[PDB]
């Protein structure tokens, strides 16, 4: 179990300007990673707007002690308001080291993100989607349970959670048909469908997938080596005005 | 500390984490620096787009707009004391946020900061601001509409926070005409039948008249602005209605007006229709009241002689004896019937003799009914009662000295009694 | 008991005085689509001076209906005395309000005086700051004050150490 | 001047 | 109370009587309109705009709509001004404040 914290840029900034002196402070060599995909928006095509740069690179010798291990992973745009955000994981003093040396470099400020119902939700359809070697998509399907914590007197109902086996998951895309987005037509109304709670308006606490991802609004934590690309571009979209 | 600061200011250089400077014993704590480290900035770097605190600003005010931030009034005093100089980029925290579209995001948000700002402002461009913040007087109309009443009091403010800074334009001798351009704008639309009437009486509208009208008797008393000769007044259809909405407050500034109106008058033409008219916009004002012509003149504002049968035949008027005069006086004005029993309890103060008044009206038959109900001798008409009510009303006992004054400078039939 | 009844009267009253404003505004309006030949959506020109016409005939009706049962008091019918009180509490807020207008305008004029007065305050500080400089034995002189950090530190220290009775701030 | 109050005018009679 | 009691009766009788002069007017509207060539045409001249502006408890009900309206919204917008006026009385004490520091710059 990995925690991810997450956190947004201000504007669009240069980072491999000098690895070379971003050692020194810091006494030990850190590398660099320059990498850039395709993000598919529509199957059928994808204009220049899915254009995105990513960075990546770790503070570390030891790969015994997993425990202090962390990465800084980077990923934004340069056309929209918001170019970029940043994710990184673990608890060390190498989180900040370089974090105060582009405070004082760039000018970008900080501030935490925000995660509400019309984003939470529709994070576990990017983690769920495959994409294998030959530019094929598949759906690895994960028996997702939801967490509800209402505020109210008397604490008359404090917690209560809905939850569906994901063969029935297949059961309802299936009669909606080939969708791109489950959770838009097989899942999220069904249970307006039949129960008539709205999830939406309803405060949501937690969105747990099977033993995949573990998404809650303060924090995303999953179990995999490193985060997906979907992942991030839909994060940006949110955080998006 | 504060002294050791001064010896290394020439050699001090400042990092760039610019929240941290804004964000709120042996050696003096950091609180006391801080208050002088965005002096420090300021004075560091000159005033332009380029400087980083003045970005964080812009940033900012967009995060709270958006409800991004954690509570939208956590930066919003900061955003005030930074952004009150800087002429040059106080503009861009205005024109970039006058858009209608930042309203629909958080209409409350936009109220704090439209009303701090707006003041403190200075006209910059020549061209292209006055329709654009003409559109947003006009953005809130049909919009409190859309929130669901016909003026919702965004409107008010906005329409005083705008007037302001036409106070800032008329000083100023730049742009002051761009000033009255808009000024005759806003009258225009805050007189119109769908904002306010006299049946529903949300008067903000006519209350931004006469802070338009302040403004206007302020620029005049002298011949700095002048406004153009085929318009003079604010409006031929604009400010006769305020004289036919009885506000005490919409009729003294008016006046006020009108004086300001006719001290430009006798300089241009007697000729021009425009100074005809606006000439026929002070007589039947003042015909208006206490003449006994107005059911006779062929113009009340531009109305012939009727409305005296229907209303009155559906229930009779108890009352005869020249009864459309007290329709028209001061006294016998609904409005302005009261202020001359404010002013009629002063003049008997005056006269020595106190009696109190049988109704809120003063009229013949009522002051007929109020002396069969003490009082000084020697007069017992009405019409020398209300003499001594206007000239006593021509002392400054209420702030309607200026209908008074006015109804005695024209005609100079009514001069002579003042 | 009676301000219930007061609260219902202005209720109705406000209901059945917009709908005479309405019925008034569509009643003109079946005379001046037929009245000259067909108009309906001129400038507000005329139909502003409908709206001056409209706003006569109302103050008239109240100058009409309003010389009255308060012009002959019933002395215990509440019809009159009611009128009375919103004319002292409009007349009364109104003097108060106009004051709050000038004071505002004398505030905003302060406020124009008080960002010139920044403004070349601001410019004579900024010629000042042009004027300033722009902004950026040694090892023995280090090593002589970290050790006289470290011999007042065990000073203090042993002094604590042993209860001395003139332990003072050693530089 | 005029043509901007006609405007609003108008805008006023559509809404 | 009775006495009153009576005004909003008598006055249900006048919104009664109202809303048939209300509904008969549209209902007039969709033949009137019928008898005009158009609906939308040229301004009225002043012969027959006299004629339109020479015909005209109710008038005592106005009298309240109109005098309350415009005191009850009297304390409103006021302190808005007055807001206003403090916010601006407030910024003005932090203008000194400001001001006092601009002259210990010019000391230092």
């Given at each position: 179990?990995?925690?991810?914290?997450?956190?947004?840029?201000?504007?669009?900034?240069?980072?491999?300007?000098?690895?070379?002196?971003?050692?020194?402070?810091?006494?030990?060599?850190?590398?660099?990673?320059?990498?850039?995909?395709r993000?598919?928006?529509?199957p059928?095509?994808?204009?220049?707007?899915?254009?995105?740069?990513?960075?990546?690179?770790?503070?570390?010798?030891?790969?015994?002690?997993?425990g202090?291990?962390?990465?800084?992973?980077?990923?934004?745009?340069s056309?929209?308001?918001?170019?970029?955000?940043?994710?990184?994981?673990?608890?060390?003093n190498?989180?900040?080291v370089?974090?105060?040396w582009?405070?004082?470099?760039?000018?970008?400020?900080?501030?935490?993100?925000?995660?509400?119902?019309?984003?939470?939700?529709?994070?576990?359809?990017?983690?769920?989607?495959?994409?294998?070697?030959?530019?094929?998509?598949?759906?690895?399907w994960?028996?997702?349970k939801?967490?509800?914590?209402?505020?109210?007197?008397?604490?008359?109902?404090?917690?209560?959670?809905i939850?569906?086996?994901?063969?029935?998951?297949?059961?309802?895309?299936?009669?909606?048909?080939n969708?791109?987005?489950?959770?838009?037509?097989?899942?999220?109304?069904?249970?307006?469908?039949?129960?008539?709670?709205?999830?939406?308006?309803?405060?949501?606490?937690?969105?747990?997938?099977?033993?995949?991802?573990?998404?809650?609004?303060?924090?995303?934590?999953?179990?995999?080596?490193?985060?997906?690309?979907?992942?991030?571009?839909?994060?940006?979209?949110?955080?998006?005005? | 500390?504060?002294?050791?600061?001064?010896?290394?200011?020439?050699?001090?250089?400042?990092?760039?984490?610019?929240?941290?400077?804004?964000?709120?014993?042996?050696?003096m704590?950091?609180?006391?620096?801080?208050?002088?480290?965005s002096?420090?900035?300021?004075?560091?770097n000159?005033?332009?787009?380029?400087?980083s605190?003045?970005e964080?600003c812009?940033?900012?005010?967009?995060?709270?707009?958006?409800?991004?931030?954690?509570?939208?009034?956590?930066?919003?005093?900061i955003?005030?004391?930074?952004?009150?100089?800087?002429?040059?980029?106080?503009?861009?925290?205005?024109?970039?946020?006058?858009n209608?579209?930042?309203?629909?995001?958080?209409?409350?948000?936009?109220?704090?900061?439209?009303?701090?700002?707006?003041?403190?402002?200075?006209?910059?461009?020549?061209?292209?601001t006055?329709?654009?913040?003409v559109?947003?007087?006009?953005?809130?109309?049909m919009?409190?509409?859309?929130?669901?009443?016909?003026?919702?009091?965004?409107?008010?403010?906005?329409?005083?926070?705008?007037?302001?800074?036409?106070?800032?334009?008329?000083?100023?001798?730049?742009?002051?005409?761009?000033?009255?351009?808009?000024?005759?704008?806003?009258?225009?639309?805050?007189?119109?039948?769908?904002?306010?009437?006299?049946?529903?009486?949300?008067?903000?509208?006519?209350?931004?008249?006469?802070?338009?009208?302040?403004?206007?008797?302020?620029?005049?008393?002298?011949?700095?602005?002048?406004?153009?000769?085929?318009?003079?007044?604010?409006?031929?259809?604009?400010?006769?209605?305020?004289?036919?909405?009885?506000?005490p407050?919409?009729?003294?500034?008016?006046?006020?007006?009108?004086?300001?109106?006719?001290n430009?008058?006798?300089?241009?033409?007697?000729?021009?229709?425009?100074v005809?008219?606006?000439?026929?916009?002070?007589?039947?004002?003042?015909?208006?009241?206490?003449?006994?012509?107005?059911?006779?003149?062929?113009?009340?504002?531009?109305?012939?002689?009727?409305?005296?049968?229907?209303?009155?035949?559906?229930?009779?008027?108890?009352?005869?004896?020249?009864?459309?005069?007290?329709?028209?006086?001061?006294?016998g004005?609904?409005?302005?019937?009261?202020?001359?029993?404010?002013?009629?309890?002063?003049?008997?103060?005056?006269?020595?003799?106190?009696?109190?008044?049988?109704?809120?009206?003063?009229?013949?038959?009522?002051?007929?009914?109020?002396?069969?109900?003490?009082?000084?001798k020697?007069?017992?008409?009405?019409?020398?009662?209300?003499?001594?009510?206007?000239?006593?009303?021509?002392?400054?006992?209420?702030?309607?000295?200026?209908?008074?004054?006015f109804?005695?400078?024209?005609?100079?039939?009514?001069?002579?009694?003042? | 008991?009676?301000?219930?009844?007061?609260?219902?009267?202005?209720?109705?009253?406000?209901?059945?005085?917009?709908?005479?404003?309405?019925?008034?505004?569509?009643?003109?309006?079946?005379?001046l689509?037929?009245?000259?030949?067909?108009?309906?959506?001129?400038?507000?020109?005329?139909?502003?001076?409908?709206?001056?016409?409209?706003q006569?005939?109302?103050?008239?009706?109240?100058?009409?209906?309003?010389?009255?049962?308060?012009?002959?008091?019933?002395?215990?019918?509440?019809?009159?005395?009611?009128?009375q009180?919103?004319?002292?509490?409009?007349?009364?807020?109104?003097?108060?309000?106009?004051?709050?207008?000038?004071?505002?305008?004398?505030?905003?004029?302060?406020?124009?005086?008080?960002?010139?007065?920044?403004?070349?305050?601001?410019?004579?500080?900024?010629?000042?700051?042009?004027?300033?400089?722009?902004?950026?034995?040694?090892?023995?002189?280090?090593?002589?004050?970290?050790?006289?950090?470290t011999?007042?530190?065990?000073?203090?220290?042993?002094?604590?150490?042993?209860?001395?009775?003139?332990?003072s701030?050693?530089? | 001047?005029?043509?901007?109050?006609?405007?609003?005018?108008?805008?006023?009679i559509?809404? | 109370?009775?006495?009153?009691?009576v005004?909003?009766?008598?006055?249900?009788?006048?919104?009664?009587?109202?809303?048939?002069?209300?509904?008969?007017?549209?209902?007039?509207?969709?033949?009137?309109?019928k008898?005009?060539?158009?609906?939308?045409?040229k301004?009225?001249?002043?012969?027959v705009?006299?004629?339109?502006?020479?015909?005209?408890?109710?008038?005592?009900?106005?009298?309240?709509?109109?005098?309350?309206?415009?005191?009850?919204?009297?304390?409103?917008?006021?302190?808005?001004?007055?807001?206003?006026?403090?916010?601006?009385?407030?910024?003005?004490?932090?203008?000194?404040?400001?001001?006092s520091?601009?002259?210990?710059?010019?000391?230092?």
């Open positions: 179990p990995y925690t991810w914290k997450f956190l947004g840029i201000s504007k669009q900034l240069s980072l491999e300007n000098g690895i070379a002196k971003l050692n020194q402070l810091l006494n030990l060599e850190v590398d660099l990673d320059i990498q850039t995909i993000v598919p928006s529509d059928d095509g994808g204009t220049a707007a899915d254009e995105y740069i990513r960075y990546e690179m770790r503070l570390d010798i030891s790969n015994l002690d997993e202090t291990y962390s990465k800084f992973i980077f990923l934004g745009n056309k929209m308001e918001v170019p970029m955000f940043l994710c990184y994981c673990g608890t060390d190498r989180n900040e370089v974090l105060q582009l405070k004082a470099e760039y000018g970008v400020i900080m501030w935490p993100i925000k995660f509400e119902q019309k984003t939470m939700i529709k994070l576990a359809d990017a983690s769920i989607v495959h994409v294998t070697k030959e530019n094929i998509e598949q759906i690895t994960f028996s997702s939801l967490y509800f914590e209402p505020e109210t007197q008397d604490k008359n109902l404090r917690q209560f959670s939850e569906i086996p994901r063969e029935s998951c297949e059961g309802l895309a299936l009669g909606y048909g969708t791109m987005h489950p959770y838009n037509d097989a899942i999220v109304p069904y249970i307006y469908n039949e129960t008539g709670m709205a999830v939406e308006r309803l405060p949501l606490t937690s969105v747990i997938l099977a033993g995949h991802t573990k998404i809650m609004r303060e924090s995303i934590v999953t179990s995999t080596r490193s985060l997906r690309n979907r992942v991030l571009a839909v994060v940006l979209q949110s955080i998006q005005f | 500390s504060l002294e050791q600061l001064a010896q290394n200011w020439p050699q001090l250089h400042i990092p760039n984490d610019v929240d941290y400077m804004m964000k709120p014993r042996k050696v704590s950091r609180d006391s620096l801080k208050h002088l480290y002096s420090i900035i300021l004075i560091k000159s005033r332009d787009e380029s400087s605190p003045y964080w812009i940033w900012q005010l967009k995060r709270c707009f958006a409800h991004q931030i954690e509570t939208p009034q956590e930066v919003i005093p955003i005030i004391s930074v952004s009150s100089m800087d002429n040059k980029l106080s503009s861009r925290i205005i024109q970039t946020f006058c209608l579209k930042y309203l629909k995001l958080d209409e409350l948000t936009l109220k704090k900061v439209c009303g701090g700002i707006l003041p403190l402002w200075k006209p910059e461009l020549i061209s292209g006055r329709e654009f913040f559109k947003f007087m006009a953005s809130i109309f919009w409190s509409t859309r929130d669901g009443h016909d003026n919702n009091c965004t409107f008010s403010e906005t329409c005083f926070y705008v007037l302001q800074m036409i106070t800032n334009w008329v000083l100023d001798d730049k742009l002051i005409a761009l000033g009255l351009t808009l000024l005759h704008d806003m009258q225009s639309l805050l007189t119109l039948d769908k904002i306010f009437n006299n049946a529903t009486s949300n008067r903000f509208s006519t209350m931004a008249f006469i802070s338009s009208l302040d403004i206007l008797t302020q620029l005049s008393k002298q011949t700095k602005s002048d406004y153009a000769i085929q318009y003079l007044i604010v409006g031929p259809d604009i400010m006769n209605k305020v004289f036919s909405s009885d506000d407050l919409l009729l003294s500034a008016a006046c006020r007006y009108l004086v300001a109106t006719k430009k008058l006798m300089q241009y033409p007697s000729t021009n229709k425009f005809r008219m606006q000439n026929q916009y002070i007589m039947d004002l003042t015909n208006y009241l206490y003449r006994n012509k107005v059911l006779s003149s062929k113009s009340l504002f531009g109305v012939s002689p009727d409305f005296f049968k229907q209303i009155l035949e559906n229930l009779y008027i108890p009352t005869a004896d020249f009864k459309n005069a007290k329709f028209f006086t001061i006294t004005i609904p409005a302005l019937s009261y202020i001359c029993i404010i002013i009629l309890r002063r003049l008997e103060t005056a006269e020595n003799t106190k009696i109190k008044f049988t109704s809120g009206i003063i009229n013949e038959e009522t002051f007929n009914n109020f002396f069969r109900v003490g009082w000084i020697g007069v017992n008409n009405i019409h020398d009662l209300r003499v001594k009510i206007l000239m006593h009303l021509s002392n400054t006992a209420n702030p309607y000295r200026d209908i008074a004054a109804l005695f400078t024209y005609l100079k039939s009514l001069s002579k009694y003042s | 008991s009676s301000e219930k009844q007061w609260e219902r009267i202005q209720q109705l009253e406000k209901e059945h005085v917009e709908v005479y404003r309405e019925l008034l505004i569509t009643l003109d309006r079946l005379y689509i037929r009245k000259h030949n067909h108009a309906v959506i001129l400038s507000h020109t005329q139909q502003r001076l409908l709206e001056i016409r409209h006569l005939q109302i103050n008239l009706e109240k100058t009409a209906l309003l010389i009255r049962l308060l012009e002959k008091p019933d002395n215990t019918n509440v019809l009159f005395t009611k009128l009180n919103l004319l002292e509490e409009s007349n009364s807020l109104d003097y108060e309000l106009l004051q709050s207008l000038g004071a505002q305008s004398s505030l905003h004029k302060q406020l124009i005086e008080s960002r010139a007065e920044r403004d070349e305050l601001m410019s004579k500080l900024i010629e000042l700051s042009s004027k300033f400089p722009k902004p950026t034995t040694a090892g023995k002189q280090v090593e002589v004050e970290k050790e006289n950090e011999i007042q530190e065990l000073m203090i220290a042993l002094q604590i150490h042993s209860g001395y009775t003139n332990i701030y050693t530089i | 001047n005029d043509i901007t109050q006609d405007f609003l005018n108008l805008i006023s559509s809404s | 109370k009775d006495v009153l009691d005004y909003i009766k008598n006055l249900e009788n006048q919104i009664g009587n109202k809303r048939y002069f209300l509904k008969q007017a549209q209902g007039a509207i969709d033949e009137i309109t008898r005009s060539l158009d609906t939308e045409g301004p009225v001249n002043s012969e705009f006299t004629e339109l502006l020479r015909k005209p408890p109710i008038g005592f009900s106005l009298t309240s709509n109109f005098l309350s309206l415009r005191a009850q919204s009297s304390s409103e917008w006021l302190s808005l001004m007055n807001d206003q006026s403090v916010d601006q009385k407030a910024m003005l004490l932090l203008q000194n404040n400001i001001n520091d601009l002259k210990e710059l010019l000391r230092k």
